[PDB]
Amino acid sequence: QPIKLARVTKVLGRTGSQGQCTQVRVEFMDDTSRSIIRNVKGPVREGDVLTLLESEREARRL
Amino acid sequence: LRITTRKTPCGEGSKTWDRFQMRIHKRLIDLHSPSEIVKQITSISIEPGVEVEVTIA
Amino acid sequence: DKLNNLVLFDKATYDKLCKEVPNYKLITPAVVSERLKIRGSLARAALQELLSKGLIKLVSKHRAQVIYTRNT
Amino acid sequence: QSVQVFGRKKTATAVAHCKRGNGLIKVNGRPLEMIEPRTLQYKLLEPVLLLGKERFAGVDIRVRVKGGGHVAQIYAIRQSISKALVAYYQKYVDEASKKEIKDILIQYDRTLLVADPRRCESKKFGGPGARARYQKSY
Amino acid sequence: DIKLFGKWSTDDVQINDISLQDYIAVKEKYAKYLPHSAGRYAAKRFRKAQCPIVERLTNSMMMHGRNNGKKLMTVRIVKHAFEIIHLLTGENPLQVLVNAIINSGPREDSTRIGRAGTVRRQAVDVSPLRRVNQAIWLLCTGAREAAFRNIKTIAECLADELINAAKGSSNSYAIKKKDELERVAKSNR
Amino acid sequence: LVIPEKFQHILRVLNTNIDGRRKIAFAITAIKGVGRRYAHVVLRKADIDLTKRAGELTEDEVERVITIMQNPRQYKIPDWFLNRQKDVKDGKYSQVLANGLDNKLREDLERLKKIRAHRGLRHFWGLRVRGQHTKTTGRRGRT
Amino acid sequence: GRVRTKTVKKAARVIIEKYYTRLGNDFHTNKRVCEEIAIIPSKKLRNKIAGYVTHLMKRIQRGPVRG
RNA sequence: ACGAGACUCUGGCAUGCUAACUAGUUACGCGACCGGUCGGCGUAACUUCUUAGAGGGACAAGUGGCGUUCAGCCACCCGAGAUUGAGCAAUAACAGGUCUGUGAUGCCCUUAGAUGUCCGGGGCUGCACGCGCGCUACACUGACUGGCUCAGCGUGUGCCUACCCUACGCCGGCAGGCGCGGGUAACCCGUUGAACCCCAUUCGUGAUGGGGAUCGGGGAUUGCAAUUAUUCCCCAUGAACGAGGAAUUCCCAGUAAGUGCGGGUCAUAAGCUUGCGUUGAUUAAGUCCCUGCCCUUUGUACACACCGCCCGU
C-alpha cells in the first residue's frame, strides 16, 4: 500500500472493551477531500500526524 | 502531642486508628520592673485556660 | 569444574594487547576480557598498565567504567 | 545586609546575602563550583552560564542553604542565586536589564525563581506510604 | 548556545519524519546542561510532551528493585555510554538517538476490535506519543536484559542497543520488537 | 607476566581441595577454623603483596604465612580475635590447618550429646538452640 | 469538579435580586459588597458566592436570565 | 430538612503587619598579600531566612473552543497555588466483635478451691504439617577502609521508680563501668555530621566477601536469676535463589519504588505498627471486559424475604 500520512482533525471519542481505542477523524494532506475515521492506540492529541502505510481499512462508525 | 490509638476496644475490624492531637502554645515576655509592679501587673485580669508563671531573668 | 578465564599475563594476553587494540575505538575492560578470554580484573590491570606506559589518554573512571580516547 | 530574597526547594531553603563586589560567588564556605556531587554541578552552574559571567561580576552574593538531602539542597542554591540577582538588579540598577534577565531565566526554566510547591505527603495507617496499602488475602 | 552536557550540540539534529517531531524535543528551547530536572511534566496532559527527549530517556532508565529512584545514577550511566557511542560512531549522539527512536517507535499494532470485542485483536494506528513511550521502554528493557547475566557491565548495553536501533541491527531489542508489533498488526487485519 | 617455572593450579595447604585460580585470601578461606577477616589480617601482617595472585609468588611467602597462622600468639595477634579461647574441659591452644580444631570443637558437641543434656539432646535432634525459633524449619526433606 | 452548590447559587441569586444596584462586573467589588451586605461566615464561601455573582452579572449582560 | 458541599486542621505565597541575647541576619580586636574563609570569629544596618499570631490570597476570576448556546468540561498567556492530604460524616440495619474494662450489667459459684489473698515450676518460644503479613537475596545498575558534603517528624531529667536524652575526657579491637554534669527543653543532646554521591591501587559469573543456625567458643546492663535461651561487640566454611509454571494483592505527582530516623512497643528488646524527612518515574485523563456495588425497567406462587418457597415417590 502507498505510504501517505494523515493528520488528526477531530477526536471522535473512545472505543474498545476497556475503552483504549480512540476514534479520530484523519485527513490526508493531498486533496483535503477525504476525512476517514481511524481508531488509534495510546495518548492521542488533536493536530498531530499519523504515519499510514495502510489505509484500505476503516474504523467502525455510524 | 500526636498520639495514635486503636479505635476498637478489641481486635475485630479493619485497621482503624484514632489520631489524637493536643497543641501547646508558649509565650514569653521580658520586662525591666521591680517585683511589686510585676506582681500588680500580673493579677489585674486573667481568663481560665492560660497558665502564668513569673521567673527570674 | 569451574569456568576457565585467564588470570595471568600470558601469551594470548601479550598477543594483540598493544598493537591491535588501539586500532579499535571501543576500549573498555569488558570488550578486552571478551576478546582475549580473560577476567575483568586482568583487563582493568592491562588497561591500567598501558595507561601507565603513556599510550592512550584517559577520559574518566569511577570504579570499572573507564574510557580511553585515541589521537590518530 | 541582604537583598532579602530567599529561595526554596522541598524542605530546603537558601538565601543569598548580597553586597557590592566583583562577582565572587560562595556557598557556605565554598564557591559555586566545588560542590560535592560533581554531577549535579551543572545544576549549580545553570545560571552563571545561562546568562553569562559578566552579569555575575559586579555583585557579591553568599548563598547560605539549610535543608534536607543533596539534590533538595540544590534547586535552592541556584534558584536563590538567580532570584537574588534579579532582585538586586530590580532594586538597585534598573528594570530593563532586570526584565531581560528575568525573561531569560523564565524562558530557560519557568521554575527558576518560583518555588516548587510540592511537599512530601502524609502517611495513612493501614499502609506504608501515602497511597500504598497493606496487602491482604481474599 | 545551549549544549547538552558540555559538548553535544543541538543544531546537527533533524527529525525528517514529520510523524513524531512535536513529541521529540532536542533542538527547541528545551536545551539543558544536565539530564536531571524533575519538573511537572507528569502532572497534566498537553504538558507531558514538552519534556526534552533526553530528559524522558534518562527518566525511564532506572527501574527494577533498588535501581528505581536513582536518577543521578542514570545521569552517570547516560554520560557514560554516550561518550561510548560518540567514540564508536563519531557521529552526534542526539541524532543517532533520534534515528533509533524513529526506527523503533511502532506505527500500527493491535487493540480491541472497534466498537466491541475481546476474542481477538484488531490493528489500529499507534499514536506518536505512545510510540515514543514504547520505543524508550524497549530501549531500556533491552539494555538491561543485555546486561543481565552478562560479563559486560552497564553503559555498554545501552550504547550497543541504541546504536543497533539507530542502524537497524537485529541484535537491537527495540527495532526487533518494533517489527514484531507491525507483524502482529498485519496478522490481525 | 609469564613466570617460566613453578606455576601451580591445585594449591594445597593441608589436605584441602582449593582452587589455584582464586585470589590470595580468597582461597585460604577454606580453613574451618579461621578465614576471611583473620586471613586478611594474617597476610597483611606477614608483609605479602596483595596485588598478586596465589601463584605468582615465591614459596617463602606461603611458608611464613603458614608459620604465623599456626602460631598466632608468637606474632602479635590478640586473644580475642580467634576461636579456641578457654572453654570446657581444658583451654584450647594453637589453631592448626584444616579441621585440626574443628574436630576438637565438634567433639565437645559429641560430649554434649553423650551426656543427655536438654541443649545437648536438642543439638542431637537437629533443633538449633542459640535462640532459633521453629515455625518453618524442618519442613522440606524432613524424614 | 467545580459545580456550584445550591447554597452558593441561592445566595448569589438573592444577592443579585436584592442588591443589584451596588453589584458590578468586577469579582473583587462583588466580594467586598457581599461581605458588607450579608453575613457570610466563611471567606471561601464568600468567594464562591462572589464568583457566581460575577457570572450571573455576565449572564444579564448577555441579556435575559432564566433563573 | 439530614447526608454531599459548606466546616476545621493541614500543604503551598505574602519582604504587607503585631516582634523575638530559649534564632539568626546585620555589630570586628590574624585583615594570615599590597579586595576576600568564620558554625578556624584571629573573644548598636533588625525580623530576610526561624518561629503559626491577626489579616490577605483563588473565585472557574480573564481569553479561546465545545455545550439546551444553561449547568458545566477542555486549552492557555497570568498567578505561590487553576483538583494538597486528612478529620467529621445521614436513614436504616448486621443475631459482625467485644461480658478478657468495673455494682455498667439480667442467670450458676453457699457445706473450709469465695478468686475479695495467691503461684516454686512450666503454655501459646517445643511438633508429620497447610496457611497469612513482611524482611534479607536475586548482580556485576551489584560491592571489598569509605575519605567529603544535609535535614524531617519528634522524644527526653518521675511523686507510684536509679527505671530519660545524654555533651566531654579515662579505662578496651568489645558489649559495659568512672567522673564533671548540659537539658524540666527554639536554652543540652543538636547546626539532630546515618541512607547516599566519589575513587590517577585491590571482587569478576563462584556458590561465592550478592549471602545466614556463617553449627561452637570469647560477652554482660546502679534490675530474679537469658532455659528450644525474643537482649547481646569478636572468629571460615551452608544450606537456598539464575525473576520465582497456577493465582494475583496495592498503586491518580513529591504518588509507586529506593532506603534510615522517632514514638507504641520498652528493666535491654523491632522483621510489627504508627508518623517523619530523605530520590523521582515510561506510565492514566479512559472504560464497563472482569470483580463488585448502586439505580431503572421487568418477572415472582418469595415477605422468616432464594440459605425463600415448593412438588412427587
UniProtKB/Swiss-Prot annotation, chain A:
Annotated function: Component of the small ribosomal subunit. The ribosome is a large ribonucleoprotein complex responsible for the synthesis of proteins in the cell. Part of the small subunit (SSU) processome, first precursor of the small eukaryotic ribosomal subunit. During the assembly of the SSU processome in the nucleolus, many ribosome biogenesis factors, an RNA chaperone and ribosomal proteins associate with the nascent pre-rRNA and work in concert to generate RNA folding, modifications, rearrangements and cleavage as well as targeted degradation of pre-ribosomal RNA by the RNA exosome.
Alphabetic keyword roster: Acetylation, Cytoplasm, Diamond-Blackfan anemia, Endoplasmic reticulum, Nucleus, Phosphoprotein, Ribonucleoprotein, Ribosomal protein
Keyword Nucleotide-binding: no
Subcellular location: Cytoplasm, Cytosol; Cytoplasm; Rough endoplasmic reticulum; Nucleus, Nucleolus
Name this polypeptide is given: Small ribosomal subunit protein eS28
GO cellular component terms, semicolon-separated: cytoplasm; cytoplasmic side of rough endoplasmic reticulum membrane; cytosol; cytosolic small ribosomal subunit; extracellular exosome; nucleolus; nucleoplasm; ribosome
UniProt modified residues of type Phosphoserine: S35
Principal location listed in the UniProt entry: cytoplasm
UniProt cross-references to SUPFAM superfamilies, sorted A to Z: Nucleic acid-binding proteins
InterPro entries: NA-bd_OB-fold, Ribosomal_eS28, Ribosomal_eS28_CS
Protein family according to the UniProt entry: Belongs to the eukaryotic ribosomal protein eS28 family.
GO MF, any single term: structural constituent of ribosome
Curated annotation (Swiss-Prot), chain B:
Keywords: Acetylation, Cytoplasm, Isopeptide bond, Phosphoprotein, Ribonucleoprotein, Ribosomal protein, Ubl conjugation
GO MF entry, a single one: MDM2/MDM4 family protein binding
Subcellular locations according to the entry: Cytoplasm
Keyword Ribonucleoprotein in record: yes
Post-translational modification comment from the UniProt entry: Polyubiquitinated by ZNF598 via 'Lys-63'-linked ubiquitin chains when a ribosome has stalled, initiating the ribosome quality control (RQC) pathway to degrade the potentially detrimental aberrant nascent polypeptide. Deubiquitinated by OTUD3 and USP21, antagonizing ZNF598 activity.
Residue list for modification N6-acetyllysine: K15
Source organism superkingdom: Eukaryota
List of residues that carry Phosphoserine: S33
Record GO cellular component, one term: membrane
The keyword Ubl conjugation is annotated on this UniProt entry: yes
GO BP term, example: translation
Coiled-coil stretches: none
Subunit structure: Component of the 40S small ribosomal subunit.
Protein family: Belongs to the universal ribosomal protein uS10 family.
Function (record text): Component of the small ribosomal subunit. The ribosome is a large ribonucleoprotein complex responsible for the synthesis of proteins in the cell.
The protein, known as: Small ribosomal subunit protein uS10
Organism listed in the record: Homo sapiens
Gene designation per UniProt: RPS20
UniProtKB/Swiss-Prot annotation, chain C:
Modified residues (N6-acetyllysine): K2, K11, K19, K25, K53
Keywords: Acetylation, Cytoplasm, Ribonucleoprotein, Ribosomal protein
TM stretches of this protein: none
GO biological process: cytoplasmic translation; ribosomal small subunit biogenesis; rRNA processing; translation
Localization: Cytoplasm
Keyword check for Ribosomal protein: yes
Residue positions, PTM N6-succinyllysine: K11, K53
A molecular-function term among this protein's GO annotations: structural constituent of ribosome
Cellular component terms per the entry's GO annotation: cytoplasm; cytosol; cytosolic ribosome; cytosolic small ribosomal subunit; extracellular exosome; nucleolus; nucleoplasm; nucleus
Similarity comment text for this entry: Belongs to the eukaryotic ribosomal protein eS25 family.
The protein's assembly and partners: Component of the small ribosomal subunit.
Free-text function comment from the UniProt entry: Component of the small ribosomal subunit. The ribosome is a large ribonucleoprotein complex responsible for the synthesis of proteins in the cell.
Protein name according to UniProt: Small ribosomal subunit protein eS25
Section covered of the full-length record: 42 to 113 of 125
UniProtKB/Swiss-Prot annotation, chain D:
Keyword Ribosomal protein annotated: yes
InterPro entries with a match to the protein in the record: Ribosomal_Su5_D2-typ_SF (IPR020568), Ribosomal_uS9 (IPR000754), Ribosomal_uS9_CS (IPR020574), Ribsml_uS5_D2-typ_fold_subgr (IPR014721)
Disulfide bonds: none
GO biological process, one term: cellular response to leukemia inhibitory factor
Keyword Secreted: no
Record note on quaternary structure: Component of the small ribosomal subunit. Part of the small subunit (SSU) processome, composed of more than 70 proteins and the RNA chaperone small nucleolar RNA (snoRNA) U3.
Designated name of the protein: Small ribosomal subunit protein uS9
